[PDB]
């Protein structure tokens, strides 16, 4: 099958292009690889170009997607902007099941593209600790004062585990809070490298 060499791309502002690996590991299969960029609402967006936008991979082979900056420097310079990278893997002719009725699948892999401005003040490792929480009778709001998108996970309220949340820079995000939810909050985050960050005590706003 086909896989990508990252769960996220950090695009440093001012750089011409960034690379993203694509691999197929099956010598006896051939994939078509289509790639495009969408904005945070999932709409196809042209401020980032992917080349080659369409190509073939025959057998065991590693290829390189190039992600080019086409924003013309129109994005905010004080906060990450969120985009989505889409890589569709289209299989080929399984001539074995020709006489048959078939459900034919293709794979699309969607990972976050973060446009990270140049002279941000707070280093990225220090972002996760700055998360704050606001609590209501049946909802919990996460407050992110940093310029970085925070991907919050292992969110716990007492014994009960909550939805993950994607907290925008200098913004908020809310998740549902069951009745049997406890008082103390812990969370983790997923950092630039795709790893889990250390469990942290949630701090009330």
């Amino acid at each position: 099958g086909v896989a990508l060499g990252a769960t996220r791309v950090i695009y440093p502002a001012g750089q011409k292009q960034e690379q993203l690996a694509v691999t197929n590991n099956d010598e006896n299969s051939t994939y078509l690889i289509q790639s495009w960029v969408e904005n945070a609402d999932g709409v196809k967006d042209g401020r980032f170009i992917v080349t080659p936008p369409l190509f073939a991979m025959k057998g065991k082979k590693e290829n390189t997607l190039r992600i080019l900056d086409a924003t013309n420097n129109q994005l905010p310079q004080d906060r990450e902007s969120l985009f989505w990278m889409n890589v569709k893997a289209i299989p080929s002719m399984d001539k074995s099941k020709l006489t048959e009725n078939t459900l034919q699948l293709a794979i699309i892999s969607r990972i976050k593209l973060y446009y990270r401005p140049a002279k941000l003040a707070l280093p990225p490792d220090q972002a996760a600790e700055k998360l704050r929480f606001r609590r209501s009778a049946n909802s919990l709001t996460l407050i992110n004062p940093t310029p970085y998108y925070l991907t919050v996970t292992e969110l716990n309220a007492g014994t009960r585990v909550l939805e993950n949340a994607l907290v925008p820079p200098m913004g908020e995000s809310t998740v549902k809070l069951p009745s049997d939810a406890g008082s103390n909050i812990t969370y983790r985050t997923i950092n630039d490298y795709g790893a889990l960050t250390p469990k942290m005590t949630g701090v009330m706003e």
Partner: protein, 112 residues
Amino acid sequence: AGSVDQTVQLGQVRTASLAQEGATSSAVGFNIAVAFLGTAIDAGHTNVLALQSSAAGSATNVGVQILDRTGAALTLDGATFSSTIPFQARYFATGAATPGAANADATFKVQY
């Protein structure tokens, strides 16, 4: 003899390439009777450099090896010696490697 200090780039390596003890990255040549000295990743792997830790989170279960012309991984006590002289470097996995920065430190004197 000219380039006393130099940085050898090992690349960007995905965790599934270093998923179990013994796993190795794509070696990377570099050159410059040679003993190497560094911090062992642990007491079972004296031939593997420990990674320097990062505030952003360093990788785990993986370190850096150095190999001479014989293709064998050199011991890193500053006493084991290897027989311009080329080498190569690579990652070595001691467990299931986790994501993060993976930089490593070493020194070397020379002996005749």
